[PDB]
C-alpha cells in the first residue's frame, strides 16, 4: 500500500489525474451553463 | 594548425592526454598543483579539433582550451 | 501591391542587419573600461531582465493570439 | 538427454510495488536520482533497452518474451473494443439489409459543445461518424448477421486479453524460461510453421466452409438476415447444407477416398470477382486457405528436433559457399541465435515488406464483400498499410546497425559474407550513389523538361503520349500475359486473378468496382520516380549499417556508440555521423517515397478506374481522365490534384466533415512547429533558459532539478516526430474528407 | 611481417604515395583476430607485425585495440615519399599519460581562462587574445 | 453606438442568422421521423440554438454589420462583463496556482532529498499548501514589503 | 575565514557557481596555486559538483 | 484587423528577442564564458557541457532571419 501510494504520487500519474479532474469540471460547467461569451 | 592552450587551473588528472585521438597532449612535471604534473601540447600539428580533451577536463572552466584555426590535411582528417 | 511588399521586405533585411552589426560591435570593438558605468555598459548588466521580459511578452502575445484564432475556428 | 527440452526457473522475480516507486531502477546511472531535467527524458528513452539494463542474455530474453505477451493483451483489448462499439454504437444491422445505401458508422460523439455536428446522418435512423476501417465488410464475410454475436466476440476478446496479461506475469515472475529454452530455432520454426500458420489456416477454412459460405450465399440470393438459419443449424443439419452445396450429401467419404473432385461445389478456382458483392468468391478463398494449410504443415517438418530426421540449419548455411564468397554463410547461425537485434532486423524488414504487398494485392483483388465500391475504405486501407510498412522497413535497418555496433564480433566473422561486405563497402556505396544520381536526374528531369516546354508554348516537345513518348513496354507485356493466362497457362482457372490486368468492368450499385488499368507514358514516369525514392532511402540506411563501426573520418566510431551526437567541430565538422543519424535522415526520405506512392494511387484511381457507369456503357470517372496529360508536369499535380481535390477539406466547415478541416489545419501547424527543432541548436536554447531562470531566482524560487535544454539527439528526434505527424496527418484528413464525398 | 588480411577497398590511396604515409609495428605472443580500422578482420602473426595506414588516428585507434590484447610495445612511424621516416609514438619511450622527467611545458598560460585580454585592446595587431 | 455598432437585440442580421441556423437543423430533422431518436436529438439542438441567441439578445453585447457579437475592452464598465469581470477571475486563479507552487518548492527545498520531492510529490503537504492560496494577494504584498520576495544580487550572473 | 566546513561565496566570474554559496572541504597548505576545495549542491553543465579555488576568490558567508 | 495586428506584434517581439539576445550574449554566457575570444561566428564549442550547437552570435542572425521573413509575410 505505502509503495503503491508512492507510485500514485509520481509526477506523471498526479498530472493525469489532476488534469482529468480539471477537464471534467470544465466540461461539466459547460454542460449545465452552456454558450457563454461573457458573464451574461 | 589549431591552437591548444593549458591554463594554471590544471590539476594533473591526465584525463585529457588519455582522450586525445592523435597524441597531441603530454603530461609534464610541474609544481603548481598537488599532483605535481601539468599538461602540455607539444604536437598541435596533429590536432583534428575534436575537443574530446575539453570534454574530459574536470575544472570549473576548461583548463585546456582548443581554438580552431588554419586547416591542413592533418587537421581536416583527410585520408585521401 | 508590388511597391509595398518590396519596401517592407527591404526594411526587414535592413533591420536585421542593424542588430547583427550591433553584435559584431560588442565582440570586436567594445571597450569595457572606457564605458565604465556608461549607459551602454549598464544595459549589459541587466541583460537577463531585458531578455526575460521580452520572452514573457512574446509568450503572452503568442498564447492568446493563437488561442483566440483557434477558438474562432472551432 | 533430449536435444530439445523445457527448462524453466521457478519464482524468479518477486512481485511488489517497491520498484514502481523508484523511477529509474532499471538503470545504474538513472537510479542515483534526478539532478537535471535530462534525467527525466533519459528515463523514458532507456526504458526498453534491456541490453543496456542487464549483461545476461537470459535476462534480456526473459523480458522480451513477457513484454510480447503485454502487446498481445493490448491488441486483444483493441479488437474487443471495436466489436463492442459495433454492437452498441453502430448501424450494422441496417447496413446489412441495404449495403449499397447505408453508410458504415461505429463511433458516436456526446452532445457536448456543438461537437454533435460531427454526428452525421449516415443512414438507417442512425447518426454517427463514418468509419473507414472496413469492419462491416469483414463481419459480413464471416457471416455475423446479428449484433448479439458481435457482443460475444467482444467478451471473448476481453477474456483473451486477460489471459495474455497473466501469461506475461507468470512467465516472468513465476516460471521464467532459461536461455537454453529460447535457443531452439528448429523447434520454434517447426511449431510456428505447422501449428500457428498451418493449423490456423485449416481452422479458418473450417469456419469458412461450414459457417461463412452457406450464410453468404443466402445473403447474396436475397434472404433477409433474420430469415437466415443460425450458424449452429448449418453445422448440425447436413441436409440444409446439401441444398446449398449439393456435395455435402456424400459426406466425408469422398475425402478419405481419393475423390476430392466431388467437393468442387464449395472448393473452386473461379477467379475474378463476385458480380453481386464485388468481392472475391468465398469458395475460392476457402480452397486458398485449405491449400496453404497443407503446404505450411508439410513445411513444419523440415528441421531436426528430437527424432533424427530433419535438417540442421547450421549445416545448410555452412555448406552454401562459393568461389567468389569465401567462407560463405558460416557464422550467421550463431549471430541469429545469439543476437535479438539481428533477428529483429530481418523480421521487421520482412513484416513491413508484407504490409506493402498487402496494400497492392488487396485493392486489385478486393477480398471483402462491398469493399471496392466503398472508395473511402479502399483508400484508407491502402494508405494505412503502406505507411505501417515503410516505418517497419526503416526500423529493420536501424536494428541492423545496432547489431553491428553492439553484437558484431570480428573473431566470429572471418572471411564470411558479412566480413567481405564490410571490406568493399566503399565500392558498394559509391556505385549506389551514382545509381541514385542517374535515376534522379533522368526521372525528375522529365517533369522539369515538360514544365518548361508547356510554359514556353512548345507542347510538341514534351515527353507525352502525344509527343515524344516513353511507353512502359515491359509492363504492358506482362499484363497481356496475365490476361490470356486463364485457359492457357492456367487451364483450370475461369477468369483473371485481377481485372486490373484486363477484362470487363465489374460494377456494383452503379459504381465501378474494378476495371482494366492501362499503363502509358505518365505511368512510366511515375514508376521510375518511385525507384529513385526507394533507392535513395536504401543508400542512407545501408551506409549507416556498413559504416557503423568505423569510417575514414572517425576510425573508432564503434566506441562512441550507436547514438552519439557527433565527434566534434574538428575534421571540418563531424555532425550527425552516427548510425542513429542515418536512420533519422532515412525516415525523411521514406516519408517522401510513401507520400508519392499514395498520391499516385489516389489520382490514378479517381481518374482511370473509380466512377459510375450507366445502364448502357458510359463510364464517368471521378476526375475525368486528367491523369494522362496533367500528371506529366509538376504544375499539373499542384493544380489538378492538390488544389482541386482539396476543395473538400477547405469547405468542410459547418458540416459533419468539419473535423477533417480542423485536423488539416492542426497538422500543418505541427509540421511547421517541428522545423524549429530541426533548424536550431541546443546552445541558443540553453542560454535563453539561463535568463529565464534568473527571473525565478530573483523571486527567491527555482527548481532543484535544474532546467536544461533538450539534448542534441533528442532535439532531432522531437523534430522528426512532429514533422512526420504533421505531414501524415495533413494527408490523412485530405484523403478522408475527399473520399467521403466521392463515395 | 604483415598480418594476415585478404584485402579491402578501404586501404590507402595516392596521398600515401605522393604526400605522406604511416606505419605501426607490434609484437604478439599468439595468433589472434583483430578488427582493422579500415574495415574487416585480420589475424595477427605470432611475433613481429607491421601494418600501413593513411592517418595517424587510424594507427592510434588500432593501438587502443591492441592494449585490450595486452600488447603495449607498439610503435608508430611516418614515412615520407622520399623514404625519410619519423618516429612519432611513444615519442620518448614513455607513454604520454605518464609524467616523464625531462619533458618541458609548451603552450601554457599562467592564469585562469578568464584573464585573457579583451579583443578590442589587441585590434589591428594580428595576434589573438588567446595568443596575446 | 460605440464604434457605430448596433445592439444585437436590434440587429436584423443577428435575427437572420438565428432563423437560418434553425432552418438548417429542422430541414435535417424532416428526413427522420416522429420520435425517432435522431429527430428528437435535432429537436433538442434547435432549442439550445434559440436559447443562445436569446441570451445574447438580452445581453448588452453589440453586434456589427455581419450580425456577429463584437466585444468591447477599453475599460468602460458598461461592458465589464465582456473582459474586466472575467479578467479578475483569471488573475485570481492564476495567482493562486503560482503562489502555491512557489510555496511548495521553497518548502520542500530544505528537505532530506529536495529533488525526490519534485518527481514524487508529497501529496499531504501539497494539499495543505494548495488550500492556503485563497489569500495570495494579501500574502504576496506582505512578503514584498518584508523584503522576502525579491532577491538582492546574490544570484548567479553571466560572465559579462 | 576559509577553513574546513566553512561556507563561502564564489567570486570567480567564469564559475558556474558565481555569487553562490559552497562549503570549503579542505585547504591545502603546500603553496599550490589554488588551495581551497569547495563543494556545491548543484551540478554544473558538465555534471561536476566540486572545484578548487584560491582564497581571494572566496568570501566567507555567515 | 485587431487580431492580425497582435500577430504582427508577436513577430516583432520574437524577432527582437533573438537578435537582442544574440547581441547581449555575444561576449559571453554561462555555457561559454569565453565566447569573446572565439569571435562573432564559430561552428560550435563541442559536444560537451551538454552540447553547444548554434551558440555563436552569428547563429542568432541565422535564426532571426526566419522569423523576420515570417513577420514580414
Ligand atoms: C526539393 C528539395 C530537395 C532536392 C532537390 C534534393 C536533392 C537531392 N538530395 Mg536531398 N534532401 C532534402 C531536399 C532536397 N534534396 C531535404 C529536405 C533533406 C532532409 C532530409 C534531404 C536529405 C538528403 C539526403 C540525406 C540525401 C539527399 C540526396 C539528394 C540527391 C539525390 C541525387 C539526385 O537525384 O541528384 C539529382 C538532383 C536533382 C536536383 C535532380 C534535378 C536536377 C535536374 C532536373 C537534373 C539536370 C540538372 C543538371 C545536372 C544541371 C543543370 C545545369 C543548369 C541547371 C545549371 C539530390 C542532390 C542524397 C544524395 O546526395 O545521394 C546521391 C542523400 O543521400 N537528400
Ligand atoms: C551598408 C550595408 C552593409 C555593409 C557595408 C556591410 C558590410 C559588412 N558586413 Mg553586413 N549586413 C548588412 C549590410 C551591410 N553589411 C545587412 C543588411 C545584413 C543583414 C542581412 C548584414 C548581415 C551581416 C552578417 C551576418 C555578417 C555581415 C558581415 C559583414 C562584413 C563582411 C561582409 C562579407 O564578408 O561579405 C563578403 C561577400 C559576400 C558574402 C557575398 C554575398 C553573397 C550573397 C550572400 C548571396 C547572393 C544572393 C543570391 C546569390 C541571389 C541569387 C538568386 C538568383 C538565383 C535569382 C562587412 C563589414 C560579416 C562579418 O563578419 O562582418 C564582421 C557577417 O558575418 N553582415
Ligand atoms: C508553427 C511554427 C512555430 C511555432 C508555433 C513556434 C512557436 C514559438 N517559437 Mg519558434 N521557430 C520556428 C517555428 C515555430 N515556433 C522556426 C521554424 C524557427 C527557426 C527560425 C523558430 C525559431 C525560434 C526562436 C529562435 C525562438 C522561437 C520562440 C518561440 C516561442 C515564442 C513565444 C510564443 O509564441 O509563446 C506562445 C507559444 C505558442 C502559442 C506555441 C505553443 C502552443 C501550444 C499548443 C500551447 C497552447 C496553449 C493554449 C493557448 C491553451 C493553454 C491552456 C491549456 C493547457 C488548457 C513559441 C513557443 C522564442 C522562444 O523561445 O520563446 C520565448 C525564440 O526565442 N522560435
Ligand atoms: C481501443 C480501445 C477503445 C477505444 C479507443 C474506445 C474509445 C471510446 N469508447 Mg469504448 N470500449 C472499449 C474500447 C475502446 N473504446 C471496450 C473494450 C469496451 C468494453 C468495455 C468499451 C465500452 C464503451 C462504452 C460502454 C462506451 C464507450 C465509449 C467510448 C468513447 C468515449 C470514451 C470515453 O469514455 O471517453 C471519456 C473517458 C472516460 C470517462 C474515462 C475517464 C478518464 C480516465 C479516468 C483517465 C485514465 C486514468 C489514468 C489511466 C490513471 C492511471 C493510473 C495507473 C494505475 C495507470 C470513445 C470513442 C462511450 C461512448 O461512445 O459513448 C457514446 C461509451 O458509452 N466504450
Ligand atoms: C500487478 C502486478 C505486477 C507487479 C506488482 C509487478 C512488479 C514488478 N515487475 Mg512486473 N509484470 C507484470 C505484473 C506485475 N509486475 C505483468 C502482468 C507482466 C507482463 C506484461 C510483467 C512484466 C515484467 C517485466 C518484463 C519486468 C517486470 C518488472 C517488475 C519489477 C519492477 C517494476 C517496474 O518495472 O515498474 C513498471 C511500472 C509501470 C507502471 C510500467 C507500466 C507500463 C505500462 C504497462 C505500459 C502500457 C500502458 C499503455 C497501455 C500504453 C500507452 C498508452 C516489479 C517487481 C521488471 C523487473 O524489475 O525485472 C527484474 C521487468 O523487467 N515485470
Ligand atoms: C504449436 C504451438 C505454438 C503456437 C501456436 C505458437 C504461437 C505463438 N508463439 Mg510460440 N513457441 C512454440 C510453439 C508455439 N507458438 C514453441 C514450441 C516455442 C519454443 C521453441 C515457442 C517460442 C516462442 C517465443 C520465444 C515467442 C513465441 C511467440 C508466439 C506468438 C507469435 C505472435 C503471433 O503470431 O500472434 C498470434 C496470436 C494469437 C494467434 C493469439 C492466440 C495465442 C494463443 C496462445 C494460441 C494457443 C492455442 C489456442 C488456445 C487455440 C487452441 C485450439 C482450440 C480452440 C481447439 C504466437 C501466439 C512470440 C510471442 O509474442 O509470444 C508471446 C515470442 O516471442 N513463441
Ligand atoms: C517490433 C518493433 C520494435 C521493437 C520491439 C523495438 C525495440 C527497440 N528499439 Mg526500435 N524501432 C522500430 C521498431 C521496434 N523497436 C521501428 C519501426 C523504428 C523506426 C522508426 C525503430 C527505431 C529505433 C531507434 C532509432 C532506436 C530504437 C531503439 C530501440 C530499443 C529501445 C527502445 C526505447 O528506447 O524504448 C523507449 C520507447 C519510446 C520512448 C517510444 C515512445 C513513443 C514515442 C514518444 C513516439 C510516440 C508517437 C505517437 C504514436 C504519436 C501520437 C500522436 C498523438 C500524441 C497526437 C528497443 C530494443 C533505441 C535503442 O537504443 O536501441 C538499442 C534507438 O535508438 N529503435
Ligand atoms: C492606452 C489605452 C488605454 C488604457 C490603458 C485605458 C485604461 C483604462 N480605461 Mg480607457 N479608453 C481608451 C484607452 C485606454 N484606456 C480609449 C481609446 C477610449 C475611448 C474609446 C477609452 C474609454 C474609456 C471609458 C469610457 C472608460 C475607460 C476606463 C478606463 C479604466 C478602467 C477602470 C479601472 O479602474 O481600471 C482604465 C484606467 C473607465 C474609467 O475611467 O473608469 C473609472 C471608463 O469608464 N476608458
Ligand atoms: C548478381 C549475380 C550473382 O548472383 O553472382 C553471385 C556471385 C557468385 O556467388 P558464389 O556462387 O561464388 O557464392 C555462393 C554463396 O554466396 C552462396 O550462394 O557472387 C558475387 O560475387 C556477387 C558480386 C556483387 C554483385 C554485382 C552487382
Ligand atoms: C510625433 C508624434 C508621434 C511620435 C511619437 C514618438 C516619439 C514616437 C517614437 C518612436 C520611436 C522612438 C521609435 C524607436 C525605435 C527604435 C529602434 C528601432 C531602435 C533600434 C536599435 C538598434 C537596432 C540597436 C542597435 C545596436 C545594438 C544592437 C547594440 C548597440 C549598438 C547598436 C546601436 C548598433 C505620435 C505617435 C505619432 C503621434 C503624435 C506626434
Ligand atoms: S582537440 Fe582532439 S586532437 Fe586536439 S588536443 Fe584535444 S583531443 Fe587531442
Ligand atoms: S583534464 Fe583538465 S585538469 Fe585534468 S590534466 Fe587535463 S587540462 Fe588538467
Ligand atoms: S555541439 Fe553540435 S556543432 Fe558542436 S561538436 Fe557537437 S554536434 Fe558538432
Describe the structure.
The structure is cut from a larger assembly and holds 8 protein chains of 7 kinds. Helices cover 6% and strands 21% of the residues of chain B. Chain B is mainly β and 80 residues long. In chain B, a hairpin with a 7-residue loop joins strand 2 and strand 3. In chain D, 59% of the residues lie in helices and 3% in strands. Chain D has 29 helices and 8 strands. In chain F, strand 2 and strand 3 form a beta hairpin. Chain F is elongated and about 70 Å long. Classes of the chains: A mainly alpha (40), B mainly beta (80), C mainly alpha (74), D mainly alpha (743), E alpha+beta (132), F mainly alpha (160), G mainly beta (62). The structure holds chlorophyll A (CLA) (8 copies), 1,2-dipalmitoyl-phosphatidyl-glycerole (LHG), beta-carotene (BCR) and iron/sulfur cluster (3 copies). It is classed as photosynthesis. The entry lists the keywords photosystem I, photosynthesis.
Tell me briefly what this model is.
The PDB classes it as photosynthesis. The structure is cut from a larger assembly and holds 8 protein chains of 7 kinds. By secondary structure, chain F is mainly alpha-helical.
User: In one word, what is the shape of chain D?
Assistant: globular
Terminus-to-terminus distance of chain C: 32 Å
Assembly form of the protein: part of a larger assembly
Could you spell the SSE succession of chain C in H and E letters? HHH
By DSSP, the count of extended strands of chain D is 8
Classification by helices and strands of chain C: mainly alpha
Total strands of chain C: the figure is 0
Bound molecules: chlorophyll A, 1,2-dipalmitoyl-phosphatidyl-glycerole, beta-carotene, iron/sulfur cluster
Query: How would you sum up the global shape of chain C?
Result: flat
Number of helices of chain C: 3
Helix content of chain D: 55-70%
Largest interface: B-E, 40 and 35 residues
Please state roughly what percent of the residues of chain C sit in beta strands, choosing from under 5%, 5-15%, 15-25%, 25-35%, 35-45% or over 45%: under 5%
Largest sheet geometry of chain D:
2 strands, antiparallel
Report the major sheet of chain C: none
What gyration radius of chain D follows from the Cα positions, in whole Å?
29 Å
Strand order of the largest sheet of chain D: 1-4
Could you say which structural class the secondary elements and strand pairing of chain D correspond to? mainly alpha
Helix content of chain C: over 70%
